[PDB]
Write a protein that binds this DNA or RNA. Structure first.
Ligand SMILES: Nc1ncnc2c1ncn2[C@H]1C[C@H](O)[C@@H](COP(=O)(O)OP(=O)(O)OP(=O)(O)O)O1
Ligand SMILES: [Ca+2]
Ligand SMILES: [Ca+2]
Ligand SMILES: [Ca+2]
Length: 341
DNA sequence: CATGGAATCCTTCCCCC
DNA sequence: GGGGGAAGGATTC
């Protein structure tokens, strides 16, 4: 079992560099403008020239400007990045029938057949990086190992523009040496819960009664960490299928006024439908981001598919249910359609 | 100050043999 | 007691 993970470098920003090479070498910040006030919004991502100074995904645009007032600030163009991503996925396809597209810039390839060992896997890695750089002029990081998780960890250690194999020998030393937090699927909240139980490295998950772990982080997450710690984790590479499509936008001013909100809501529904394209959902959920950044949602599943008129109609009742049961003002409003026929 | 899409898993019901 | 689902939320990438 040999898995090869591919991760495109500072992707959105690198695509902007490819489309305007004069940007290369300069700090580039791709941002999502929320239109509330001058430069309100967050950074979707930045190239390494910008990251070396603290500008990265998640910080407020305003804060990035105080640090790199002279960098190049660009509005995110998801659509353009999606199309460049697709072309890249199709390149990888020619290297394996078994491929899992995990996100817009992450993909796992099950090359258990194509290759016979890590050397031939590595060489296939270089061949892929080179093919993608030549065809699309986009640099990527390849991670190679026994399963998906270590393949990903491999890439994280080797970025940017790297390639790395984590052989069975290192897998074991990592199970003992690797900080539990650097394990995929372990965010801040779960890392903390684990600290309290005294688990700082994967192996530590064995010196704890399972049921106590289950109680603390849940069974699914418990079984997950244990199988990795025992070097027995092995989920197959499968193509994932879209299960929900939705869109959430930001209002210029927080509100509680139904008529002031509807517009942004219908706007989200429209965009969501244009994207559903031929797909018919039986479920709808209205999502609201409260003024204190909390997330509330009300939804309903129908016994048949939802027409756009039914969506408009039903979404307003759900938004009203939200306002009725929560007294806080709304900052962001949106919808999500799921359970496709 | 703090955008945004989406999967999966966890609880709490609820209907019902 | 437990299958079968739907809701609302927690958590992660
Ligand atoms: N907070 C965010 N808001 C919007 N888009 C985001 C956000 N965080 C990440 N993205 C995008 C950023 C990337 O272009 C793409 C994710 O890849 P990651 O974010 O994993 O890598 P990156 O390509 O920006 O970093 P790296 O230098 O490791 O390649 O998802
Ligand atoms: Ca990346
Ligand atoms: Ca990635
Ligand atoms: Ca982490």
């Amino acid at each position: 079992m040999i898995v090869l993970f591919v991760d495109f470098d500072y992707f959105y920003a690198q695509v902007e560099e490819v489309l305007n090479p004069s940007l290369k070498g300069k700090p580039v910040v791709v941002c999502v403008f929320s239109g509330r006030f001058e430069d309100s919004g967050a950074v979707a991502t930045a190239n390494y020239e910008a990251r070396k100074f603290g500008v990265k995904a998640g910080i407020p645009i305003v804060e990035a400007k105080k640090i790199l007032p002279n960098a190049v600030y660009l509005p995110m163009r998801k659509e353009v990045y999606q199309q460049v991503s697709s072309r890249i996925m199709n390149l990888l396809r020619e290297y394996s029938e078994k491929i899992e597209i995990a996100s817009i810039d992450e993909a796992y390839l099950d090359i258990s057949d194509k290759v016979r060992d890590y050397r031939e896997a590595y060489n296939l890695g270089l061949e892929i990086k080179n093919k993608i750089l030549e065809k699309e002029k986009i640099t990527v990081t390849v991670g190679i190992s026994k399963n998906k998780v270590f393949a990903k960890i491999a890439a994280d250690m080797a970025k940017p523009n790297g390639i790395k194999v984590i052989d069975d020998e290192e897998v074991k030393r990592l199970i003992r040496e690797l900080d539990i937090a650097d394990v995929p699927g372990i965010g801040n909240i779960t890392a903390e819960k684990l600290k309290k139980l005294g688990i700082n490295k994967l192996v530590d998950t064995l010196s704890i009664e399972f049921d106590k772990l289950k109680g603390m982080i849940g069974e699914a997450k418990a079984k997950y960490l244990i199988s990795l710690a025992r070097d027995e984790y092995n989920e197959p590479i499968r193509t994932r299928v879209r299960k929900s499509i939705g869109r959430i936008v930001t209002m210029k001013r927080n509100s509680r006024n139904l008529e002031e909100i509807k517009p942004y809501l219908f706007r989200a529904i429209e965009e969501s439908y244009y994207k559903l394209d031929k797909r018919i959902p039986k479920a709808i959920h209205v999502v609201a981001v409260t003024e204190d950044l909390d997330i509330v949602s009300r939804g309903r599943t129908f016994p048949h598919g939802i027409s756009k008129e039914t969506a408009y109609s039903e979404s307003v009742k759900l938004l009203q249910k939200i306002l009725e049961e929560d007294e806080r003002k709304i900052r962001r409003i949106g919808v999500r359609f799921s359970k496709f026929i």
